[PDB]
Every structure is written in C-alpha cells, then in structure tokens.
Amino acid sequence: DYWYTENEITHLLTAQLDEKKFSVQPAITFRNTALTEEMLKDYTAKGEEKNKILAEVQETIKIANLIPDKEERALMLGDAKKREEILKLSDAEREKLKNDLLRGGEAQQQINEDILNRATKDIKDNGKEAAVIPIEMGYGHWTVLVAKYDKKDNQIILTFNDSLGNSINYDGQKLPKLIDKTLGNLPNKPIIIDEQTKQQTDQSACGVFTVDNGIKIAKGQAILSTEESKGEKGLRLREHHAQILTDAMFKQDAQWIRQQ
C-alpha cells in the first residue's frame, strides 16, 4: 500500500533514467531469516524426533495465542499452525517441500550473483555510466546499490544507501558477502562507498528514497541529507512519484497513494 514493490521502484527508475547511459537492474533480494539444520528438521525428522517437534508446535500454538500484540500474535500463530500442517504431511512430501525450499534459496543466490555480474558487464563492456540495483534486505526493506566503473584505473565502484540509517552491513554482512563472492576475484577489488545517510525511519519510506537515491547516485549528485529528509520530504517525493507514475501507469500511483 504505502510500501513500494519492486514494480514501482523499477518503473520510477526507468522513467527517470536515460537507458542509453544507465541500466536499471532487477532487484537483488535477500531473505531476512537464516536457514538452519534445526529448522529443516520440520521436514526431515521422523518417528520420535518428529513426535517431539509436533508436540512443541502444538504447545506454541497454545501460547502464541496469548501474545498481547495483535499483529505479532497473528504472525507467530499463523506460522505455528503452518508448521503443524507440515509436520502432519507424509515423510515423502515433507522431503519435497524441503527440496523446494533449498532449490529456491539456491536460485535466489545465483540470480543475485547474476544481477551483480550483469550490472558489472553493463558498465565495463556496454558503455553504461551507471548500473542501478534495487536491494531488498528483507520484506519491503528497500535499499539501493549503484555500480560505476573507472576505466582509467580499471576500478569498479559500488555506492550504497539505506534510508532507514543502517549501514551496508545490515543483517550479518549479507550484501558485502555477496559482493565479495561475486566480484572479489577482479583484478582490482570493488571499492565500496556507503553513504550511510539516515533519511527516514519509516519502513514505508524505503522505496521512496531508494528511487531518489538511486537516481541521484547514478547521476553523480548528492543524495538528500539527513537534514533535508526531515519533515514531509518523503511525502512530497511520494506525491511526485505518483505523478511520474500517473504520467504512464495509473494503478501504481493509486498503490503508492493508499494509507496502510
């Protein structure tokens, strides 16, 4: 509603960036939950180990019901109930479910690398002066990474910002780990510039500033400082974004307009 989806971010960026000079990449997305061997026992535990887990799930349901915050309660309870359903499946189906989960996670990390590499190919081989990559650090936690290339020094430079005021190391250095996995073998290590500019602490505003930061960084212009970001700037940007959207795609203007 208030929260931007990748669809708007991509359109807003494309609409405000010369495609001959700038390439807008599809989003790099990270899960915010870690996969653990213990979590997977929901799929692999059999016999008594399985019975013990089903037992704890059923107890959780009984307690999760009591969580005082209504929104938090619904989330924890819904997930416990889902877990109960999973534990009730056949061993064979729990196994397929686990494999689906692992397949998706593997796809996600390979696709994330491919986007970083494509962005790098764009600025290094295809004449683009910037590649803009929207980065989702978690559900709706939109941030931006802009890739540029100094040919004279054969040097890749990546510029990041998180409008909420987190560093690029947010959530266990997942993004720097990706960058180094993908590009840490280049003749010259990628230089990382973290703008670390807190702009607005509403998670609703992440997509608004992701767009504005990406555009500005792409063009070599200073992003909106903490000072300029105060007040109704997030609103004005959002209104402005709805106009740009309206000047083509009406349904996404209406989305950005909703309250939440």
Residue numbers in the entry: 423 to 682
What are the paper's exact sentences on this?
CE clan proteases, specific hydrolases for ubiquitin-like modifications (SUMO and NEDD8) in eukaryotes, reportedly serve as bacterial effector proteins with deSUMOylase, deubiquitinase, or, even, acetyltransferase activities. Here, we characterize bacterial CE protease activities, revealing K63-linkage-specific deubiquitinases in human pathogens, such as Salmonella, Escherichia, and Shigella, as well as ubiquitin/ubiquitin-like cross-reactive enzymes in Chlamydia, Rickettsia, and Xanthomonas. Five crystal structures, including ubiquitin/ubiquitin-like complexes, explain substrate specificities and redefine relationships across the CE clan. A comparison to the previously determined SENP2-SUMO2 and NEDP1∼NEDD8 complexes (Reverter and Lima, 2004, Reverter et al., 2005, Shen et al., 2005) revealed differences among bacterial CE DUBs in three variable regions (VRs) near the substrate binding (S1) site that were arranged around a structurally conserved helix (constant region, CR).
We determined high-resolution crystal structures of the CE clan effectors SseL, RickCE, and ChlaDUB1. To this, we added entirely uncharacterized CE clan proteins RickCE (Rickettsia bellii, GenBank: ABE04279.1), LegCE (Legionella pneumophila ssp. pneumophila, GenBank: AAU28953.1), and ShiCE (Shigella flexneri; GenBank: EGK20985.1). Interestingly, the remaining bacterial effectors SseL, ElaD, and ShiCE are Ub-specific proteases, and ChlaDUB1 and RickCE cleave both Ub- and, to a lesser extent, NEDD8-modified peptides. In bacterial examples, the analogous region is either disordered in the absence of substrate (SseL) or not part of the crystallized construct (RickCE). In fact, RickCE has an ∼75-residue insertion at this site that forms a helical arm in the crystal structure. Matching their specificity profiles, ChlaDUB1 and RickCE can both form covalent adducts with Ub and NEDD8 suicide probes. Deletion of the inserted VR-3 helix of ChlaDUB1 or the predicted VR-1 outside the crystallized boundaries of RickCE resulted in a total loss in recognition of the Ub/Ubl probes. The Ub/NEDD8 cross-reactive enzymes ChlaDUB1 and RickCE fall into their own clade.
